[PDB]
Chain length 64, copies 3
């Protein structure tokens, strides 16, 4: 149960890291608008991963 | 405390889902731009993220 | 351990708050397309802190 929480929290954290990775690409593209398409595809990749990680976190947490 | 932690985490995770939704719309607009309501939509989802995280901290304080 | 879980999640929540601050600056910039540069600069600062906070979260969590 304690282990249950830890494993779940870990997925939440990776989900957050994925959002941070996505947010840094945002800064790059916004800067630029003053390669972008490959940055956009990249954002999509890390965003889907964030979503994948959060669903896992939620799936686990439910087990508590 | 275990049940309180759980209840607190659920809000955190909801907060993250909202940011992801906010990031979805961000990607849309950026994609649109390199080829107003999307914006209104970002605000709604971001504010819910705030409410969720706020709630998470409140329950967390009871632990 | 519960004291530790609370400690790590605490940091996790801080990180989320910083991502929210970064998202707020993004909406502003997207709406401007104000002070894009300044705006894009706060985004970066906000994101960095978020990053610092998640790493502290991951660190504490490992103590569980």
């Amino acid at each position: 149960n304690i282990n249950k929480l830890k494993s779940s929290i870990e997925s939440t954290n990776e989900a957050v890291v994925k959002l941070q990775e996505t947010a840094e690409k945002t800064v790059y593209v916004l800067t630029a608008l003053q390669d972008i398409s490959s940055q956009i595809s990249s954002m999509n990749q890390s965003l889907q991963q964030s979503k994948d990680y959060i669903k896992e976190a939620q799936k686990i947490l439910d087990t508590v």
